[PDB]
Amino acid sequence: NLASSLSVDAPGLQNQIDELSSFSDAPSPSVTRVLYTDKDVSARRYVKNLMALAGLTVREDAVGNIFGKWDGLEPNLPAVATGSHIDAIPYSGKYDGVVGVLGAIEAINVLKRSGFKPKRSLEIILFTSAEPTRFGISCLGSRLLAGSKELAEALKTTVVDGQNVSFIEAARSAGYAEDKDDDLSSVFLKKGSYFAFLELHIEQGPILEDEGLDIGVVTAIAAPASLKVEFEGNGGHAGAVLMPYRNDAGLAAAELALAVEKHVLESESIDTVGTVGILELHPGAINSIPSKSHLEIDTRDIDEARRNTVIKKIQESANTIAKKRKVKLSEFKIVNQDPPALSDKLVIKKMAEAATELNLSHKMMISRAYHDSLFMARISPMGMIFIPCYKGYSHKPEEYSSPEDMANGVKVLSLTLAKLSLD
Template identity: 80%
Template sequence: MALAGLSVREDAVGNIFGRWEGSEPDAPAVSTGSHIDAIPYSGKYDGVVGVLGAIEAINVLKRSGFKPKRSLEVIMFTSEEPTRYGISCLGSRLLAGSVSLVTALTQTADNANISFLDAAKSAGYAENEDFSSVFLDENSYSAFVELHIEQGPILENEGISIGIVTAIAAPASIKVDFGGNGGHAGAVLMPQRNDAGLAAAELALAVEKHVLESGSIDTVGTVGILEVHPGAINSIPSKSHVEIDTRDIDEKRRNMVIEKVHESAVSISQRRGVELLEFKIVNQDPPALSDESVIKAMESATQVLGLSHKKMISRAYHDSLFMARKAPMGMIFIPCYKGYSHKPEEYASPEDIANGVKVLALTLAKLSINS
C-alpha cells in the first residue's frame, strides 16, 4: 500500500494516522479517512474506498504540485463494524472522547467470553489499558471529510455521480435475551411450553410492525441476529438472543420505536411465560449534521470537475457520525451497484471511485488553504 510518504502513527486502540505536514503545522489539520474492517460475508468497498481513496487523493495532490497550508491527515479507523464486541465505530467513538465507552470497554467480552482488553492486548494494543489517551484534543482538526459508497440505490437510479451528505441518520442498537424451560420437543405438550425461540420470533415481527407504524419512510429497523439455544431440532429453545438495529433521521421518532419494542418484549414475555432476561440499549446515538463549510467545499469541487451531484441523507452510519463531535464534518458518496452493501455483491465502478477520489482531493485542498 503506497502510503504516499505520510508520517504514520497509531493510537492505543489501533486507529492509524498518516500525516502530510502543511506549511502551517500548528494549525488544526484537515482530516479524511474511513475503515477497512467488514462484517462476515460482506463486500469489498464499504469503508475501503474511503481509506485507499484518501491515500490516492493525497497522491493526486502531491503529483499536482499542491502544497498544503493546514496539514492533511488520513485516518484508518479501528472496528467500524460492531461485529465482535457489539460496539460500532469503536475507533471514532473513542476519538470523539467517550468516557462511558472507556468504562464499558473494561467490562466487555465477546461471545467466547474473551474480554476486550485481552483481545486488544493480544493484537498488540492497549498497553497501559487507558483508552482515554485516544481522545482527540478539541482543536485537532479544522474539518473531517469521508469518502464512502452510498450503500443505497439512489445515485445509481438517478444517474448522479456524487452524493453530498447533509445528515447521518441516528442509529440505535438493542440486545434482547429471553429464557424459558426448554425441554423435549416430543414430550412437553403445547400448553406446558414457554418457548424462548417463539418469543424471539414474535419480537422480530414486532420490530418490523413498530417501524412501519412510524409512518415515515426514513424509519428502519432490522433483526440481523436471532439465535436459539440449544439449537437442536428436537429441543424446545430454552434461550434466545436477538439483536436489533433501528435508525431514523429523526431521533425522537426512532426513540419512540425503541420504546414500543421494549413494551412488546415485556408483553411477549408475560403472555408466553418466558423470562425477559435482558433488554439492553447498547447505543442510542444522536444524528449528525454536515457542516456548511465542508458542504460548500464539496459542492465547489464537483462543479470544478463538472460532475453531477445531489444533496442526500446517509441512512447508514459512519465514523463521520462521531468525528462530527470533534470537527466540522462532511461526506462524499459515490454510486454502488443496485445499492447493495454488506453482502458480497457490493460493487462500485473504477470510474465512480475515481470521481469520488477527485472530489475528495479538491475538497481537501480547498479546506487546507481555508483560514
C-alpha cells in the same frame, strides 16, 4: 488549474481494493474481516505500507487508530483529516469503508502528482474499527477519539466478545494497548484539533445510480440505535412435552421479530428502519425446546424522536410477549442510542464547489448508514462524499462501485482537501 490537473490511477486503485479483499475469513467474493483478528492485522500492515509509500508520517494510538500525515507549510495549524474503516462484517463486500481508506491514500498521491502544496497538514485516519461485529460496539475507534469516557471505562473493565475474550486481550494480541497504566483517555482528541474531517464512502443506496448523478454531498447522518433482547423458558424434550405445558423462548423471539417490523411500519415514515439481524436459539437442537432466545435489533431514523418511539414500542411488545408466552424477559438492553449528526455548512459548500469544478453532477443528501463521520462531527466540522454503487447493494458480496466512480470520489476528496487546507 488544480481541478483539471487531477488524475487518478483508476485500475491501480481497483487492484488495491482486490488485494485488500484477500485478507478475509470468508471465501471470495465475500469478505469477513473482524477487528483485531489475524486478517485485520494483515490488512493494517498492507494499508500502513501504502501510507509509507505515499510519503506519509505514520503513527498509531492506544487502540490502533492509524494516522498518516502529510506535513503542511503551516504544520502548527489544526490539520484537515480524512479516512474510514477497513473492517468488514461477515459475508460482506470489498468497498464499504475500504474506498475511503485506499481512496484517501490515492487522493494524497493525486495531490502530490499535481504539485499541490498544503498549508494545513493533511492527515489520513484508518479508524481501528467501525463495525459492531466483535464487541457489539460500532465505531469503537471514533467514539474514543470523540472522548467517550463511558466507553473507555467499559473497554477497560467489562467488554468481551462472544468467546469471552476481553477487549484488552484482543487489542494486545494485535499489538495495541500495551500500556497497562492507560485508561484509554490517551486516545481522546481535543475539540477543534482538526480543522475539518471528510469521509469518502460508497452511498450504500441506489439514489445516485437511479438519478444518474456522479456524487452525493452528505448533509446529515441518521440516528442509529441497537438493542439486545433475551427470553428464557423451561425447555425440555420436543417430542414429550405436550403443547399446553410449554413456554417456548423461540416462539417469543419470532413474535418479537415480527413486532419490530410492525412498530417500524407504524411510524408512517419511509425513513424509519428496523431489523433483526441476529436471532439465536439455545440449546439449538432440533429435538430440544428452546429455553433461551437471543435477538439483536438494529433500528434507525433521521428523526431521533420517531426512532425512540419505535424502541419504546419494542420494549412494550417484549414485555407483552413474555407475559403471554409465560417466559422471562431476562434481558432488554439498549446497547447504543445515538443522535444524528449534521455536516458542516461550509464543508458542504466546498464539496459542492469541488464537484462543480470537476464537471461532476451532484445532489445534497442524507446518509442512512452510520459512519465514523458521525462521531468525528463531535470533534470537528464534518462532511461526507458519496459515490454511486451498483443497485445500492452493501453488506453483501454483490456490493460494487466502478473504477470511474471511485476515481470521481477521489478527485472530489482531493479537491475538497485542497480547498480546506488553503482556507
